[PDB]
Chain length 300, copies 4
């Protein structure tokens, strides 16, 4: 299988790097306006492959994306300029890779997924935004540290906007099949309001802290996008909190935000409107209205 | 790191094979009364390794378990058609009276991981005989029933079992407890998720699923004489959790002070697995019906063990 | 993608298990005249999947092999086996015409030739495990002997999977060095007696294992799974496998093992390595035996 | 187990990232003069772990290196566009003067894996300062050049690089030696295989490949400013080799008693990697031309070290 990445900056190349080491696809093609940059990243990642799996890593143009099952959109130059980028990029991608699933990372990722969606003319399940997939992973990693258990055992969700209005879903969170409060107690911890506030801050301000420390985030999302690409290429039928055009959510219509969804060869194949407290559900409504306004004020 | 396997039969060898293919340990030592059989299995599996990971697979004596971080106990008789797991108990208790001493002599720091049926009572047996802290003697328990529950639900709803969160508690046997009350997919109550998904689970459908899990070993035994691929993978995964100090959460068996009022009994509850074996236990909130079934399961295990002075 | 396995015995089930644990294919279909046996293995292996990778394991009929890109064939004995392939091969291909056929049934070289003649496929799309297991054994034994990971031992076996197989000592290397000096100091130089022990270890391996446990399946299971992975990922990796070969040391139209490139098309290329006079004569004799065995049976 | 990385720059962070995605160790500690930098990289990589493997990734002081089984030294300046690796020597020897003793306070039993360029001289600087046995101070050396040679030969032949067994020896830099003479593909001599594949490997083809290999770093730095993905995977693989006691064979750099007549010089040869670091060295099969090139390469490294008194 062949995967494409348009926008070979830090996010795109980190994604290419994860795909290569984890052997997700037999072939990865990086596309970037800066052609020497794509080539440099491609060569560097190609050179990792003898340590891991056979992957034909290379740089190319949209034409080289032919037959790609998935193409990751991580291109950026504001929402004004970014939206103009996607106007250029999307139709060129689909020209070459008609049946590819689009995976959007470019921020603000919710609004950009909707732009990608309006431009593509494909079923909404075919245009997938990374959405809160990274926030969910952050929430899990932070509960993991707090509980000192493997994040792979923590099953917690972040929904709504990949941004400031995102909703941490505490009510239905579970660890190893056990409700979060009661697992925490067994572990010797109380999840006090103070503990919660601290974990909330940890997730909500995560990107800010990393940016101020090293200028950008890319390792986290690189891995999350590689994982979604894998979900798509293997027709995994796995559940992830990703963003996609949603007919309706809490009364808000035709908006893209993250809910738990089933990912497979067709992209999003199912959406779960899950179980939230009144507090969380209202937070999700407020989040959905934030994203709605933002997209309309741009015509998408 | 070295892993020991005692009993190089179907279960033992399938576990060693999973360990090899997954590169879990750098060295796997197979120990069997029948040295030629362990030797043949070790050769056969050694020959897989050039296709996977570097693993020194070999057959050995009990002295060769030395320095093992975990030892899997898979020696002893399996149930034949018509027979329950609890019926193996007298015979396999006698085996463990031979096995456990010899293991702790060669590898006194090893975490014991028990597979031999009936696995909950055998874990208790091993615990009594070993003199070890309860955390260090772990039975596979319902880890396989939980896997079976998730897989049948996965097949039902056509989603990856990885995304299905449901588990089984109590006895690894006829009295096990499917915990429907807290099962979720995508943060949603399982029954709600299924309806939404347009394949709802009626009472009848659940009954069929309960049977799918409950009678899986009997079906498999009748069709091919034994079960071993599923438990082999499950054992390799627990060995991995221990050797990597994973702090993962699994439904496994261990000696438990008190559960629904029944005292000093080994059965499966959600537990945290790491370098020291079981490092913590959760006693989940259950529906009244599940709580009662779990009590019943525990009294059964307690009785069976007591009758032998365990 | 989908892999099919015809013959769900020890070898077929062990292959399916390896495929499942390694997450090689998304769907694995087990087919066997003994319907309950295939079902049983399918359930047993399905239950492993939550520990590893999502894989739809199930038992079925030929119609279920549909869309398979690889199908493993692991179903006077020689006469009865040939006859199995006469029943099985047509049906597999009917249901999965684009499937590469991977043959495990013994004697694997003759059965590969049998499968080839019956299938009417390009020669590259009918591949026998051949000496792939013999090569892994040669490497594993050299690995134990030198105490280095077998992955750093590149040494192979050519010819018949069986008594006439040829260990290619002449070009064996470990870290770009010739085996013999590499050992001579790793501190243990490989006498002619040591090479003889190793030869026996490889050549008699199946005998020792069958005597000890009645059958071999783990080694071949892993090897087949690996070949299935090469095929499905279009790996273009090099393996010593068996396939219909126009000419070898003068012998014509015989199936035996040589170094070959493996990809989506099955055997996509074949290397005819230079060998010592010893090895060359051995390979010829090996080819001669297989040609004769095939001819007698009418293939 | 625990791995330390000193220098949380592009190379150190990409190495940690590879370790986390491949699940090589249970804990990874990033140490850097710029603490906010290590912290940002550590958070960023921790957040990847739910998608892959459990790994406690964190930033820390030298003190937090305690108990590390290996410590990767990736601290110091990298090449500017057009700058050669040897031009970094004096600046990075001074960095190592600070780093090496501070690592060995916290983790005197750690195997050291040196990435900082010029990696051969830096390996020899680490060796002198550490007071460790030669085998325990490992430089990545030509491990990445070997990979480039394999990857470019793989493109040339259209086979998986995993099937190409060709290596690069000597300096990790302009004077490195491509060992064409003994190169094989899947057990077969390279010339023999190239022809079977429809390739005659002309002198032009060899020149092209040599340049592809020799100048890879210059090209990548010009295009994106630095290299880190290739070496990150290479370092992770070496860390894995050490932590698992692999006994794998790799071309890495270590202090070498005598090479082609040149004495007491650190440079890349095929070596066996295990828990002790380098547990064996092979002086390989070379043509007269290759041999002379290795001697010249060793001489450049010898004089560079000696001028600094190392
Ligand atoms: N969780 C998430 O969804 C998440 C997390 C982090 C960053 N992001 C983001 O994703 C994007 C990338 O981040 P980044 O740091 O890599 O930025 P980056 O600038 O480093 O890389 C961006 C690039 O896209 C390339 N590019 C721009 N326009 C292009 C076009 N029209 N065609 C081809 N290529 C084009 C640019 O040349 C450049 O290399 C941003 O929008 C950043 O905010 C998203
Ligand atoms: N879920 C589970 O916990 C689970 C699942 C399947 C099977 N099992 C149990 O596993 C046991 C083994 O099953 P099996 O199929 O592998 O049987 P097996 O007979 O095939 O193999 C068992 C073996 O143990 C060996 N052995 C016996 N006593 C020994 C001793 N003192 N020291 C060394 N080796 C000894 C025997 O020689 C034999 O090879 C049974 O109790 C079976 O019911 C448990
Ligand atoms: N390296 C090698 O190439 C290697 C190594 C080991 C075994 N083998 C060969 O593997 C083989 C199969 O071995 P095994 O151990 O699994 O034996 P096995 O008997 O256990 O299984 C073989 C099976 O084929 C099934 N089968 C037979 N005829 C069938 C038909 N026409 N349609 C579908 N299914 C049918 C049988 O029911 C049975 O289950 C033997 O030929 C064996 O010698 C090869
Ligand atoms: N194959 C190879 O051997 C290879 C390949 C590529 C790069 N490298 C190299 O490795 C080094 C790093 O490259 P880079 O790109 O990461 O550079 P970088 O500048 O991005 O990161 C280097 C860092 O070292 C940290 N550091 C410096 N001195 C320190 C000290 N006393 N203690 C703790 N931390 C300290 C610095 O703060 C900085 O973060 C260079 O020498 C570069 O050439 C080697």
């Amino acid at each position: 299988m062949k995967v494409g990445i348009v926008g070979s900056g830090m996010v795109g190349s980190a994604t290419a790097y994860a795909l290569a080491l984890l052997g997700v696809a037999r072939e990865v093609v990086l596309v970037d306006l800066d052609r020497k940059l794509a080539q440099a990243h491609a060569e560097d990642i190609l050179h990792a492959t003898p340590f891991a799996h056979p992957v034909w890593v290379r740089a190319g143009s949209y034409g080289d994306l032919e037959g790609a099952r998935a193409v990751v959109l991580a291109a950026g130059v504001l929402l004004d300029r970014n939206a103009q980028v996607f106007a250029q990029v999307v139709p060129r991608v689909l020209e070459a890779a008609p049946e590819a699933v689009l995976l959007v990372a470019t921020n603000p990722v919710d609004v950009m997924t909707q732009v990608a969606y309006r431009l593509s003319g494909l079923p909404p399940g075919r245009v997938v935004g990374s959405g809160t997939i990274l926030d969910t992973a952050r929430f899990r990693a932070l509960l993991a540290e707090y509980l000192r258990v493997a994040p792979q055992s923590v099953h917690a969700y972040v929904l709504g906007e990949h941004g400031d209005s995102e909703v941490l879903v505490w009510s239905s969170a579970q660890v190893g099949g056990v409700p979060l409060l009661e697992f925490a107690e067994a572990r010797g911890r109380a999840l006090s309001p103070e503990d919660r506030a601290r974990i909330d801050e940890g997730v909500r301000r995560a990107a800010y802290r990393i940016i101020e420390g090293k200028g950008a985030t890319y390792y986290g999302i690189g891995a999350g996008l590689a994982r979604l690409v894998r979900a798509i290429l293997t027709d995994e039928k796995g559940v992830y909190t990703v963003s996609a055009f949603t007919p309706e959510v809490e009364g808000v219509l035709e908006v893209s935000l993250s809910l738990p969804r089933i990912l497979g060869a067709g992209g999003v194949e199912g959406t779960v409107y899950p179980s939230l407290s009144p507090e969380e559900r209202e937070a999700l409504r407020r989040s959905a209205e934030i994203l709605k306004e933002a997209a309309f004020a741009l015509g998408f």
